[PDB]
Amino acid sequence: SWTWENGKWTWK
Numbered sequence: 001s002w003t004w005e006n007g008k009w010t011w012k
Contacts, residue, residue, distance in 0.1 A: 003012045 001012050002009045
């Protein structure tokens with residue numbers, strides 16, 4: 001799942 005972190009998407 002893509003989740004938003006500080007200006008970007010990270011794969012969680």
